[PDB]
RNA sequence: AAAUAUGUAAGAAGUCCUUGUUACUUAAUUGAACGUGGACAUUUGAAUGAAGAGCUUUUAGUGGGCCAUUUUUGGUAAGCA
RNA sequence: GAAUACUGCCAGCUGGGACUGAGGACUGCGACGUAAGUCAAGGAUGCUGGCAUAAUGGUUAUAUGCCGCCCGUCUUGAAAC
């Protein structure tokens, strides 16, 4: 009789998509990424800075 | 007064092409037409018998009748709010086979060949054609191709 | 629009069998966003070479930030623009702390003095002037003098209220 | 007292308001205008084909 | 605003009920409405729709037509269903024993079926003995043999009957109908 | 004991195992999206390190919003808007990108704003304004059983299966998209950002392709 | 020699394999047309949409038009034609 | 070697304001709970105060703010000088 919006009303959000509980529990919206230290090539940097 | 004769406004459409006048080459008369063939209409101005009316220039139809020197062609014509069926008796000089239909029949043969090969190995041969797809990812190397280009040019007269 | 960014846009012709690995043409484009940057790139490649967006490709777009945003520089700017009855080349000098800000000022100034819209202007070249005595415009040279200092006479203070009880002064 | 002579204004809109319809092809088109010799022979060909089919199926 | 692709508020164009006020027809309609709703047999839906039809849309079905239909292979024992009138036919001299369910039987048709040994049945008895239209055979009369249809589509070269009161010579058989008098059609 | 509790227990068991299937499918979708995103980022970084340029794959999905009213439209664009199911202003649809649809968009440029939607935009659009076309009726989704009843023949069992079929242009994209009723969006909450809408986005207007800024526009529109 | 506009096709009434009819056709057991029987799977042969699709009867009003962008004729031009 | 801006994401948290409360036994999908149950989960309930009549409200006259050209007709076009 009345459309209830998910993205609010977490009861309806959980009725759909049972994975929202795991998402919220593990904070998958705030996932820290693994660090990497690869460096751009000197040709790339020189091309970027070129006039 | 006005003038709406049979060949009015056909001055250029019934031209022979440039340096292409004279007699018709024999392959035109050696072509074979059967009932159901799809043909294009292009009037030859040097042949005044069996010529189509200017409306049917560039129209494509279906053969329904074969006579001694002519072919009956069915053309759907726009009259008012509906299409009417029109039957033309045209000599073979004004008719050529539709290359589109020839290539479609070739595609039918190739589709059968692919399906039969997939019947042995490689199931789901995916007969249907597809529209051009967006490009996939790619890597563009700079080795020997360093990006280097200049800016827009200043104005100058060249006069 | 006037919040300009500078992008390098690198593109090329679509590779074929006869000529794989085309030549990767690159431009520097002042634009408010990447969509406009890519469009301006294709407009200029369209005008200079026999290539268009359909038969081409954008391989890279990168924002170029100012090296020293807090260093006051003098910029020579060569532009080509369309007036109401012709096309003209101009040279102008802007004292500013970044290329995008200098180009912003240039567009405002062209709009103000020559009624030239962004539509009508080609930025031929923006280059920092490395030292004084090469600055050619007096409206920029006058700010390069030693121990420069000037007052700001007739200061007008904005009132937060409709009525004032004190007959304001303009000292400063 | 002259009036407008001619115009095709609104004519395409009128033609399309009940749409433009194709002529609804059938299987077995009418043999009108077909060569009389071919039609005359085709009658006997169909007669013989039906006779042979009846003699086979029974 | 909506860019409408089809006409709005368009009625379906099909009858949802009989146009008549026959109370017994309305009782038959409510019976077959219940059957068409509570059964998956398409026979009940077909009979229900036929119960709405007008008189020109339910032409009479002759007993000769019924006998010819019963001559079909494997249809000798089926129940013939005519949603309409079954008329008599004297062109036939033999009639099989069969069950015919119809809205109306003429006196001759009913007498011929009963004499042949069969029975004439109303649609409610048909519904009782075949709730799903089991072993039925729905027959329809010739719709386009109506006299009004001859004049439909009158025009040049259409080959239809002109709408005319008196026939014979002097009545539309002159200029326009023969080459010797102007033109032919 | 009129045989009520038995089938109620069986129905609850069926629901529980169905939800377990949905849960594992959604976990797989989440890991697939995370892997695709990180692989794209790392491919860009590796091309930079090697001195090359990583040209990302051309976008496969566009979201199109009709921004012009229904009066005074030439017949050809009017027909294309009808075929794209944009029959009123602020209506939106998903279109998979081919040459055949790029020509359609290029033919209706002045009346639409379209771009490349993100996963967040697609998910919020379907969750809040997603309606199914069932028996020619507009039905609020609001439940996975509706989706499994109307698209379960394609292996689409939940709203997240539907979203996956949209964001990744899958084999049954056409069926899933046509099942989705055209989204009816409100006017943008912070306005259009421009004084005049009916110029191209490049020229300071609102129509045409605004590739990644369609996300901001649609988010404010719903 | 464009742009725009415009015809046709993108299959089951289809394709392939054997062999049946004829008074037409062939030098001919050659063809033509229409067929019996057999094979082709679900991507049955591009995209998008399809609001139900087709079919018929009958009858109203109307048959003075005018405006705008663009193309365009007469005219110096016109809120002109 | 960091920081921050810009852009983007979170099925992160939370404060203030406005409009609405359609339906009327139960049935569904969920959630939290070992279960028993409970719940914001197929549309508002709980507690409290004043009045119980011209108080609310209706009608009517007037005032104020903004808006409102005379109908019918012929006409491309009518408030028409
Ligand atoms: Mg007239
Ligand atoms: Mg606001
Ligand atoms: Mg009149
Ligand atoms: Mg007023």
From Swiss-Prot, chain B:
Pfam families: Ribosomal_L21e. It comes from the Eukaryota. InterPro entries: Ribosomal_eL21 (IPR001147), Ribosomal_eL21_CS (IPR018259), Ribosomal_eL21_sf (IPR036948), Translation_prot_SH3-like_sf (IPR008991). There are 2 genes for eL21 in yeast. One of its GO terms (cellular component) is cytosolic large ribosomal subunit. PROSITE patterns: RIBOSOMAL_L21E (PS01171). Belongs to the eukaryotic ribosomal protein eL21 family. Component of the ribosome, a large ribonucleoprotein complex responsible for the synthesis of proteins in the cell. The small ribosomal subunit (SSU) binds messenger RNAs (mRNAs) and translates the encoded message by selecting cognate aminoacyl-transfer RNA (tRNA) molecules. The large subunit (LSU) contains the ribosomal catalytic site termed the peptidyl transferase center (PTC), which catalyzes the formation of peptide bonds, thereby polymerizing the amino acids delivered by tRNAs into a polypeptide chain. This is Large ribosomal subunit protein eL21A. One of its GO terms (biological process) is cytoplasmic translation. PANTHER family: 60S RIBOSOMAL PROTEIN L21. Keywords: Cytoplasm, Isopeptide bond, Ribonucleoprotein, Ribosomal protein, Ubl conjugation. Component of the large ribosomal subunit (LSU). Mature yeast ribosomes consist of a small (40S) and a large (60S) subunit. The 40S small subunit contains 1 molecule of ribosomal RNA (18S rRNA) and 33 different proteins (encoded by 57 genes). The large 60S subunit contains 3 rRNA molecules (25S, 5.8S and 5S rRNA) and 46 different proteins (encoded by 81 genes). There is a cross-link at residue 31 (Glycyl lysine isopeptide (Lys-Gly) (interchain with G-Cter in ubiquitin)). It is found in: Cytoplasm. GO terms for molecular function: structural constituent of ribosome.
From Swiss-Prot, chain E:
Component of the ribosome, a large ribonucleoprotein complex responsible for the synthesis of proteins in the cell. The small ribosomal subunit (SSU) binds messenger RNAs (mRNAs) and translates the encoded message by selecting cognate aminoacyl-transfer RNA (tRNA) molecules. The large subunit (LSU) contains the ribosomal catalytic site termed the peptidyl transferase center (PTC), which catalyzes the formation of peptide bonds, thereby polymerizing the amino acids delivered by tRNAs into a polypeptide chain. GO terms for biological process: cytoplasmic translation. It is found in: Cytoplasm. GO terms for cellular component: cytosol; cytosolic large ribosomal subunit. GO terms for molecular function: RNA binding; structural constituent of ribosome. It comes from Saccharomyces cerevisiae (strain ATCC 204508 / S288c). The modification N6,N6,N6-trimethyllysine is found at residue 49. This is Large ribosomal subunit protein eL18A. It holds the Pfam family Ribosomal_L18.
UniProtKB/Swiss-Prot annotation, chain F:
Present with 101000 molecules/cell in log phase SD medium. GO terms for cellular component: cytoplasm; cytosol; cytosolic large ribosomal subunit. PANTHER family: 60S RIBOSOMAL PROTEIN L7, LARGE RIBOSOMAL SUBUNIT PROTEIN UL30. Component of the ribosome, a large ribonucleoprotein complex responsible for the synthesis of proteins in the cell. The small ribosomal subunit (SSU) binds messenger RNAs (mRNAs) and translates the encoded message by selecting cognate aminoacyl-transfer RNA (tRNA) molecules. The large subunit (LSU) contains the ribosomal catalytic site termed the peptidyl transferase center (PTC), which catalyzes the formation of peptide bonds, thereby polymerizing the amino acids delivered by tRNAs into a polypeptide chain. It comes from Saccharomyces cerevisiae (strain ATCC 204508 / S288c). The keyword Ribonucleoprotein applies. It is found in: Cytoplasm. GO terms for biological process: cytoplasmic translation; maturation of LSU-rRNA; maturation of LSU-rRNA from tricistronic rRNA transcript (SSU-rRNA, 5.8S rRNA, LSU-rRNA); ribosomal large subunit biogenesis. Keywords: Cytoplasm, Ribonucleoprotein, Ribosomal protein. Belongs to the universal ribosomal protein uL30 family. This is Large ribosomal subunit protein uL30A. Pfam families: Ribosomal_L30 (PF00327), Ribosomal_L30_N (PF08079). Transmembrane segments: none annotated.
């Amino acid at each position: 009789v009345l459309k209830k919006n998910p993205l609010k009303n977490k009861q309806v959000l959980l009725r759909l998509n049972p994975y929202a509980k795991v998402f919220a529990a593990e904070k998958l919206g705030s996932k820290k990424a693994e660090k990497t230290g690869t460096k751009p090539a000197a040709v790339f940097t020189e091309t970027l800075k070129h006039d | 007064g006005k003038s709406h004769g049979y060949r009015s406004r056909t001055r250029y459409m019934f031209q022979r092409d440039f340096r292409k006048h004279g007699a018709v080459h024999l392959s035109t008369y050696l072509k074979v037409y059967k009932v159901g063939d799809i043909v294009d209409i292009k009037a030859n101005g040097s042949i005044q018998k069996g010529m189509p009316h200017k409306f049917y220039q560039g129209k494509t139809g279906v053969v329904y009748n074969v006579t001694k020197s002519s072919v009956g062609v069915i053309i759907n014509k726009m009259v008012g709010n509906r299409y009417l069926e029109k039957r033309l008796n045209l000599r073979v000089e004004h008719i050529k086979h539709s290359k589109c239909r020839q290539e479609f029949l070739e595609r039918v043969k190739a589709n059968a060949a692919k399906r039969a090969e997939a019947k042995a190995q490689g199931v789901a041969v995916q007969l249907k054609r597809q529209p051009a797809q967006p490009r996939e990812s790619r890597i563009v190397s700079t080795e020997g191709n360093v990006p280097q280009t200049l800016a827009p040019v200043p104005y100058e007269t060249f006069i | 629009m006037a919040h300009f960014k500078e992008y390098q846009v690198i593109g090329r012709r679509l590779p074929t069998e006869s000529v794989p690995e085309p030549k990767l043409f690159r431009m520097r484009i002042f634009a408010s966003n990447e969509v406009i940057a890519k469009s301006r790139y294709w407009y200029f490649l369209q005008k200079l070479h026999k290539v268009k967006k359909a038969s081409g490709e954008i391989v890279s777009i990168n924002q170029i930030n100012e090296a020293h945003p807090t260093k006051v520089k003098n910029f020579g700017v060569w532009v080509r623009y369309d007036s109401r009855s012709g096309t003209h080349n101009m040279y102008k000098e802007i004292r500013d702390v970044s290329r995008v800000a200098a180009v912003e000022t240039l567009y405002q100034d062209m709009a103000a003095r020559h009624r030239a819209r962004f539509r009508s202007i080609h930025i031929l070249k923006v280059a920092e002037i490395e030292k004084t005595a090469d600055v050619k415009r007096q409206y920029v040279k006058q700010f390069l003098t030693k121990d420069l200092k000037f007052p700001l006479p007739h200061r007008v203070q904005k009132s937060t209220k409709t009525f004032s009880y004190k007959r304001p002064s303009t000292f400063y | 007292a002259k009036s407008k002579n001619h115009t095709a204004h609104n004519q395409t809109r009128k033609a399309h308001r009940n749409g433009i319809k194709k002529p609804k092809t059938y299987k077995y088109p009418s043999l009108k205008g077909v060569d009389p010799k071919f039609r005359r022979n085709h009658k006997h060909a169909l007669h013989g084909t039906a006779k042979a089919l009846a003699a086979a199926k029974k | 605003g909506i860019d409408h692709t089809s006409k709005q508020h368009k009625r379906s164009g099909h009858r949802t009920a009989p146009k008549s006020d026959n109370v017994y027809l309305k009782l038959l309609v409510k019976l077959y409405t219940f059957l068409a709703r509570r059964t998956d047999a398409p026979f009940n839906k077909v009979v229900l729709k036929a119960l709405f039809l007008s008189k020109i849309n339910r032409p009479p079905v002759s007993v000769s037509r019924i006998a010819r239909a019963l001559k079909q292979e494997g249809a000798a024992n089926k129940t013939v269903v005519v949603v309409g009138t079954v008329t008599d036919d004297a062109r036939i001299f033999e009639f099989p024993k069969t069950t015919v369910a119809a809205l109306r039987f003429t006196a001759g048709a009913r007498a011929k079926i009963v004499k042949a040994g069969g029975e004439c049945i109303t649609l409610d008895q048909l519904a009782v003995r075949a709730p799903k239209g089991q072993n039925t055979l729905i027959l329809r009369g010739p719709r386009n043999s109506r006299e009004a249809v001859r004049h439909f589509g009158m025009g040049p070269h259409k080959g239809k009957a002109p709408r005319i009161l008196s026939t014979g010579r002097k009545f539309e058989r002159a200029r326009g109908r023969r080459r010797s008098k102007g033109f032919k059609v | 004991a009129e045989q009520v509790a038995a089938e109620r227990a069986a129905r609850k068991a069926a629901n529980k195992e169905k939800r377990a299937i949905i849960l594992e499918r959604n976990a797989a979708y989440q890991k697939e999206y995370e892997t695709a995103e990180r692989n794209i980022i790392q491919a860009k970084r590796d091309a930079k390190a090697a001195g090359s340029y990583y040209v990302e794959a051309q976008h496969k999905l566009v979201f199109v919003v009709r921004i012009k009213g229904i009066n005074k439209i030439p017949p050809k664009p009017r027909k294309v808007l009808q075929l794209l199911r944009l029959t009123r202003i602020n209506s939106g649809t998903f279109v998979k990108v081919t040459k055949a649809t790029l020509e359609l968009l290029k033919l209706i440029e002045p009346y639409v704003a379209y771009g490349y939607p993100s996963y967040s935009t697609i998910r919020q659009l379907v969750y809040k304004r997603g309606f199914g076309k069932i028996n020619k009726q507009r039905v609020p989704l609001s439940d996975n059983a509706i989706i499994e009843a109307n698209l379960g023949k394609y292996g689409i069992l939940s709203i997240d299966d539907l979203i996956h079929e949209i964001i990744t242009v899958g084999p049954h994209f056409k069926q899933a998209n046509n099942f989705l009723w055209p989204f009816k969006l409100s006017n943008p909450s912070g306005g259009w950002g421009v004084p005049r809408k009916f110029k191209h986005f490049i020229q300071g207007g609102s129509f045409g392709n605004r590739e990644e800024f369609i996300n901001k526009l649609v988010k404010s529109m719903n």
